[PDB]
Design a protein around this ligand. Structure first.
Ligand SMILES: O=C(Nc1ccn2nc(-c3ccccc3)nc2c1)c1cc(Cl)nc(NC2CC2)c1
Ligand SMILES: [Mg+2]
Ligand SMILES: [Zn+2]
Length: 313
């Protein structure tokens, strides 16, 4: 009860910033997550013993893939932590509990392959879940781990509070399906601009949490340039492996996933910043002004990719 997690001074200060990098010491990531839960939620939100057992079972159920791994889980949870800490009064007690857990769990048991690849491969998960294939799997893995003995971090919640938090987690994880992001953001844009956005409307909160989930999930593009640049290598290592597997099925992959088209990566990153990233952090900044640093960092990185094209690096 009186046992606080504390970080070294540089981490204690920089963990509060949006652009924080959790570092290469894997053994410190559990403690970093617990630190964030304790400051974001409270030392009373979760039984430390159950939380620690939950975190380590979640770690175990992330795979050794180049990008969609345990480091991505904690990175996305830290971005959520930064959003929640900069928007103290906007979120309920259940939302703060659910969302850090949702982020830690959002890519559970990811194989490094897109929903498209599972569908073209005819993977069993594609017959079980026709849309948002991997995201419904991630939620399924989350419920499975929550039901392991001594793993129920929500056991002190009432029957209906428990159902509400698992519903927050489900919607939050489904929302990380980038196919659903485009329509979610357009609706939020219209709602904010016609002035109809209402944070007491549950369907409206859902949409806003969805966009936060997209923002945290994409947060590699909101880091300092050396982090963003080196993370891109991991992202494309997965894409190119999927491109290879598409070629094994007798299907020319999209250029994004073709390792023969590495030269077109800088222009491909521009498209992504302009079509996905900037629009995402812009609408997020309109709804939640204190998330402006994410939009600023994203714009800085767009400018760095422009410099790559111009041969200035
Ligand atoms: O970089 C990312 N996305 C993109 C999107 C479109 N294109 N198009 C190209 C391209 C087009 C022509 C020639 C060469 C390359 N490259 C990309 C990269 C990215 C970043 C983060 Cl942070 N997350 C995710 N997440 C999803 C994986 C689930 C994805
Ligand atoms: Mg995912
Ligand atoms: Zn993710």
């Amino acid at each position: 009860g009186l046992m606080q997690f504390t970080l070294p001074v540089r981490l204690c200060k920089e963990i509060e910033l949006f652009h924080f990098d959790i570092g290469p010491f894997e053994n410190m990531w559990p403690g970093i997550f617990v630190y964030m839960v304790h400051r974001s939620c409270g030392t009373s939100c979760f039984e430390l013993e159950k939380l620690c057992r939950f975190i380590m079972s979640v770690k175990k159920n992330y795979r050794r893939v180049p990008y969609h791994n345990w480091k991505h889980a904690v990175t996305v949870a830290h971005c959520m932590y930064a959003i929640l800490q900069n928007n103290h009064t906007l979120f309920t007690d259940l939302e703060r509990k659910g969302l850090l857990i949702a982020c830690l769990c959002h890519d559970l048991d990811h194989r490094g392959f897109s929903n498209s690849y599972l569908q073209k491969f005819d993977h069993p998960l594609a017959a079980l879940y026709s849309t948002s294939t991997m995201e419904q799997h991630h939620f399924s893995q989350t419920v499975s781990i929550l039901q392991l003995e001594g793993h129920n971090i929500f056991s002190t919640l009432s029957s209906s509070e428990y159902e509400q938090v698992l519903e927050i987690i489900r919607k939050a994880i489904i929302a990380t399906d980038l196919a659903l992001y485009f329509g979610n953001r357009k609706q939020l844009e219209e709602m904010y601009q016609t002035g109809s956005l209402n944070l007491n409307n549950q369907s409206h909160r859902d949409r806003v949490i969805g966009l936060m989930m997209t923002a945290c999930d994409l947060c590699s593009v909101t880091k300092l340039w050396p982090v963003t640049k080196l993370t891109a290598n991991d992202i494309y290592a997965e894409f190119w492996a999927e491109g290879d597997e598409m070629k094994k099925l007798g299907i020319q992959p999209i250029p994004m996933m073709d390792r023969d088209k590495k030269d077109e990566v800088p222009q491909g990153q521009l498209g992504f910043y302009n079509a996905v990233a900037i629009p995402c952090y812009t609408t997020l900044t309109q709804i939640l002004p204190p998330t402006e640093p994410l939009l600023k960092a994203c714009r800085d990185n767009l400018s760095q990719w422009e410099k790559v094209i111009r041969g200035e690096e």
